[PDB]
């Protein structure tokens, strides 16, 4: 096997994958394997790009046996993975060990789940014919307009309050003042006004 | 035409007759149901004629006052009856497990039906139910319809139900298959042996190998239908151990052993 990874705490993996389901659930995720770790990227309509990265120390049996340029790509359907994983990873403290496998190229993405003497093994065939490579909506740091660091809970509350209002068009404001009264808000307009 | 017997169990045959009720359920699912009451010890009740047979003997030694007699010339007597009323009588019997030991029932082969009597107590209540259908057939039809005709080459011994997560694992596989709509079995001789099951589709591929191998040629790939749920339900058999065998890449058995009431259900390609 070219790529191998094992984990014991699937709660982190499933709660990371739950953050990708609103739009990435359909298909066309381009998983990357390198020395840094495991990453997933989703891009639809070339309007938004998401990258979720898994580090080396997250996995317990990371081997990564390779003799190449150290960058192999694969595209797999997310919906099949979600349908497979929905039935498993049930209950709590089920100590479900997940094993990842990928034999370089031409082999399906292999997941092994073991739960109380019961093992499962699902093969995910990939799609690597019209992979145009490169891609990526990257930006240069030499001309950053502004930088902001905010708490996750406040942003989550703001977004969950904004969602049910509507507001099909939203605005982002940035403002700094001499008296350290910095201004940052996400205003929007809707049928409500 | 006198077929009278008394059913009364205390410890062991209660689970056995519950298993008989499950056999009656699957026979109601089955198209036909035939019986071959013969002598007093070996009374086969293989009710089937898809392409499945459910050969299983009945140890009537514990039963009291059981006799068989008919005008079928030889010792073999054909008997076919509808098991829909058997479910009703069995569940009404199972409802009175709180109290009542001498009630029991007595079924007799009459010229039109088969009456069943009850003596339950809530002051006693008597219930009389007659079996609707008892259509018999020729002895030639019985002798031209014979089970077995098979050999054994690669036996797959299966562990007793002391480990409850094993039957639970197969039940989980059954409900997984039901939720996600073939059941490919595999077995190897590489020593303890490994049991692996595979299901595949156009874009679906799932294979399960049960960990912690305690079950006692190789590379036997077999493709079959999804009629193995009845064997999975039959595996319960809390009294004793259940065996199995799969070979020839086209046939697989399910040997349930529960005085040895061997129960085998036949599976074709």
């Amino acid at each position: 096997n070219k790529f191998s990874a094992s984990t014991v705490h699937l709660e982190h993996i499933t709660t990371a994958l739950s953050c990708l389901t609103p739009f990435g659930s359909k298909d066309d995720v381009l998983i990357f394997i390198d020395a840094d770790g495991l990453s997933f990227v989703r891009e639809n309509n070339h309007v938004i790009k998401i990258q979720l990265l898994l580090s080396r120390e997250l996995f317990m049996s990371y081997s990564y046996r390779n003799e190449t340029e150290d960058h192999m790509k694969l595209c797999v359907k997310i919906n099949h993975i979600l349908d497979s994983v929905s039935v498993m990873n049930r209950n709590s403290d089920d100590i479900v060990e997940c094993t990842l496998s990928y034999d370089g190229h031409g082999s399906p993405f292999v997941l092994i789940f073991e739960d109380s003497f019961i093992s499962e093994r699902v093969e995910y065939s990939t799609y690597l014919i019209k992979d145009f490579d490169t891609n990526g909506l990257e930006l240069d740091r030499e001309r950053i307009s502004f930088e902001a660091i905010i708490k996750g809970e406040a942003l989550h509350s703001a977004l969950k309050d904004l969602k049910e209002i509507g507001c099909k068009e939203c605005y982002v404001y940035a403002k700094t003042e001499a008296n350290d009264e910095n201004v940052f808000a996400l205003i929007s307009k809707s049928q409500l006004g | 035409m006198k077929l009278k017997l008394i059913v009364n169990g205390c410890e062991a045959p209660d689970d056995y007759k519950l298993l008989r009720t499950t056999i009656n359920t699957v026979a109601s699912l089955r198209k036909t149901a035939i019986l071959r009451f013969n002598s007093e010890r070996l009374t086969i009740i293989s009710t089937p004629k898809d392409t499945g047979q459910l050969w299983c003997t009945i140890p009537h030694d514990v039963f009291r006052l059981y006799t068989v007699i008919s005008a079928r010339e030889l010792n073999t007597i054909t008997m076919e009856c509808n098991c829909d009323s058997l479910l009703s009588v069995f569940k009404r019997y199972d409802r009175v497990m709180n109290q009542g030991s001498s009630s029991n029932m007595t079924i007799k082969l009459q010229s039109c039906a088969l009456g069943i009597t009850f003596e339950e107590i809530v002051k006693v209540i008597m219930h009389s139910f007659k079996v609707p259908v008892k259509l018999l057939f020729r002895a030639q039809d019985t002798r031209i319809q014979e089970p077995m005709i098979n050999y054994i080459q690669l036996m797959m011994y299966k562990l007793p139900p002391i480990s409850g997560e094993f039957g639970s694992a197969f039940h989980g596989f059954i409900r997984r298959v039901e939720r996600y709509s073939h059941i490919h079995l595999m077995g190897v001789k590489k020593k303890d042996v490994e049991l692996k099951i595979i299901v595949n589709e156009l874009d679906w591929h799932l294979e399960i190998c049960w960990n912690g191998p305690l079950d006692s040629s190789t590379h036997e790939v077999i493709i079959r239908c999804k009629d193995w749920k009845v064997c999975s339900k039959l595996y319960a058999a809390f009294e004793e151990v259940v065996l199995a065998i799969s070979h020839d890449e086209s046939c697989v058995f399910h040997c349930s052993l529960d005085e040895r009431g061997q129960i085998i259900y036949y599976i074709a390609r």
Side-chain angles (χ1 to χ4, degrees):
Chain A
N1 45 216
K2 307 260 203 273
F3 157 68
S4 180
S6 299
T7 182
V8 65
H9 178 265
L10 283 177
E11 280 294 326
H12 196 94
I13 297 89
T14 190
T15 196
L17 202 52
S18 305
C19 298
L20 188 151
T21 198
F23 63 110
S25 173
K26 188 57 181 181
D27 54 355
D28 197 9
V29 66
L30 275 80
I31 318 183
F32 293 100
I33 299 101
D34 56 350
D36 186 74
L38 193 72
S39 85
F40 316 93
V41 65
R42 261 286 297 172
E43 183 177 2
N44 50 2
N45 300 324
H46 292 171
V47 65
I48 177 166
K49 181 191 69 55
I50 181 168
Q51 290 199 2
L52 193 142
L53 177 63
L54 305 186
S55 66
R56 305 182 64 77
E57 68 274 15
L58 179 65
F59 303 130
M60 295 298 102
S61 279
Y62 200 80
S63 59
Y64 182 76
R65 191 259 302 278
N66 210 4
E67 208 160 11
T68 49
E69 193 263 8
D70 275 341
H71 193 259
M72 41 176 177
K73 312 186 52 162
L74 74 164
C75 169
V76 65
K77 284 220 190 313
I78 286 277
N79 56 350
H80 303 156
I81 306 176
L82 294 174
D83 291 331
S84 298
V85 176
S86 66
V87 286
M88 301 95 78
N89 207 3
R90 58 187 155 274
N91 299 318
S92 60
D93 203 9
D94 283 29
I95 193 167
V96 186
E97 189 268 331
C98 172
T99 304
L100 279 82
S101 295
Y102 187 48
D103 203 39
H105 193 282
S107 296
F109 200 56
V110 176
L111 289 197
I112 298 91
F113 300 94
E114 299 98 300
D115 195 354
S116 184
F117 293 100
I118 318 167
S119 177
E120 289 89 4
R121 191 178 167 99
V122 191
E123 278 155 36
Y124 300 117
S125 194
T126 63
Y127 310 90
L128 285 152
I129 294 174
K130 222 185 77 180
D131 215 352
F132 202 70
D133 304 295
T134 317
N135 272 40
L137 293 199
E138 287 92 10
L139 73 165
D140 46 352
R141 57 184 175 184
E142 48 252 30
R143 44 187 54 245
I144 289 285
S145 189
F146 87 103
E147 311 182 293
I149 292 176
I150 56 176
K151 209 174 85 171
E153 174 53 51
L155 189 65
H156 172 232
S157 172
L159 267 295
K160 80 190 188 194
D161 291 331
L162 171 66
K163 184 183 41 53
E164 292 181 354
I165 300 297
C167 297
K168 66 165 300 310
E169 278 158 29
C170 179
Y171 284 100
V172 166
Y173 194 39
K175 204 42 191 293
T176 51
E177 274 89 351
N179 51 3
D180 213 1
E181 270 300 281
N182 275 16
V183 176
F184 184 80
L186 274 77
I187 62 170
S188 55
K189 269 188 209 53
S190 65
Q191 304 299 323
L192 274 77
Chain B
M1 321 185 158
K2 302 181 179 302
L3 190 70
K4 56 180 75 174
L5 73 164
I6 307 181
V7 192
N8 192 9
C10 183
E11 310 158 299
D14 291 331
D15 189 359
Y16 182 76
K17 66 209 200 191
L18 195 142
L19 198 149
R20 302 323 314 144
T21 61
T22 55
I23 301 299
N24 274 286
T25 61
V26 65
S28 180
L29 177 59
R30 193 65 261 175
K31 267 295 278 186
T32 180
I34 62 170
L35 296 93
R36 295 179 67 250
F37 294 98
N38 290 318
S39 180
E40 203 266 333
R41 287 323 196 282
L42 297 180
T43 61
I44 190 67
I45 197 171
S46 56
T47 54
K49 183 173 308 303
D50 199 75
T51 302
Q53 287 82 54
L54 192 151
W55 191 91
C56 50
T57 187
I58 301 299
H60 271 299
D61 63 358
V62 286
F63 284 66
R64 294 135 297 279
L65 204 62
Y66 165 64
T67 50
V68 60
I69 175 63
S70 179
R72 290 286 101 189
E73 185 176 1
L74 73 164
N75 305 4
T76 301
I77 295 96
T78 301
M79 171 85 218
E80 166 175 299
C81 66
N82 199 358
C83 56
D84 63 358
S85 64
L86 275 157
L87 271 299
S88 175
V89 64
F90 280 150
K91 63 177 157 57
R92 303 320 71 201
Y93 182 76
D94 291 331
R95 193 171 40 70
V96 74
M97 294 298 102
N98 199 10
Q99 272 95 27
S101 301
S102 63
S103 303
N104 302 150
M105 77 288 289
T106 291
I107 180 166
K108 185 255 295 171
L109 192 148
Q110 205 181 3
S111 181
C112 184
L114 282 85
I116 292 165
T117 63
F118 287 100
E119 209 83 11
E120 78 266 21
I121 171 167
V122 64
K123 62 186 291 182
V124 287
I125 300 103
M126 204 294 278
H127 186 83
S128 67
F129 184 15
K130 297 211 152 283
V131 167
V133 168
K134 62 172 185 67
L135 178 59
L136 311 96
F137 296 95
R138 284 319 299 241
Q140 305 179 353
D141 193 21
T142 309
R143 72 190 84 200
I144 67 178
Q145 294 178 356
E146 297 270 29
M148 301 66 68
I149 318 169
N150 191 62
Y151 69 101
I152 52 182
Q153 65 183 177
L154 194 149
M155 171 265 258
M156 181 87 48
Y157 182 76
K158 198 158 309 312
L159 61 83
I162 58 170
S163 301
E165 317 205 70
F166 175 108
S168 306
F170 288 98
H171 187 193
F173 182 76
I174 282 292
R175 56 99 173 160
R176 183 91 155 86
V177 164
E178 169 188 359
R179 258 74 166 179
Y180 277 75
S181 301
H182 278 263
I183 308 182
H184 187 118
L185 277 296
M186 287 197 44
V188 292
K189 70 170 303 303
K190 171 64 65 181
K191 60 180 182 58
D192 62 358
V193 302
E194 301 282 333
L195 181 60
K196 184 162 51 213
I197 195 161
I198 297 101
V199 54
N200 75 18
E201 291 286 339
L202 189 150
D203 53 348
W204 181 255
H205 198 210
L206 179 62
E207 46 191 356
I208 287 179
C209 49
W210 153 85
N211 296 115
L214 316 171
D215 49 345
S216 309
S217 60
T218 182
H219 196 259
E220 52 184 2
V221 290
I222 175 174
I223 295 97
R224 48 175 302 285
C225 186
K226 297 195 188 93
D227 57 48
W228 182 65
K229 52 183 75 65
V230 298
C231 295
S232 72
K233 297 150 178 51
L234 188 65
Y235 181 76
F238 307 102
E239 186 167 359
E240 273 194 353
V241 69
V242 180
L243 282 72
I245 187 166
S246 65
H247 57 272
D248 214 18
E249 306 193 358
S250 59
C251 185
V252 60
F253 277 69
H254 205 89
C255 175
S256 177
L257 182 72
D258 299 308
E259 67 170 358
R260 299 269 67 84
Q262 184 178 2
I263 307 173
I264 50 178
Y265 182 76
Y266 296 5
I267 308 289
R269 169 79 174 83

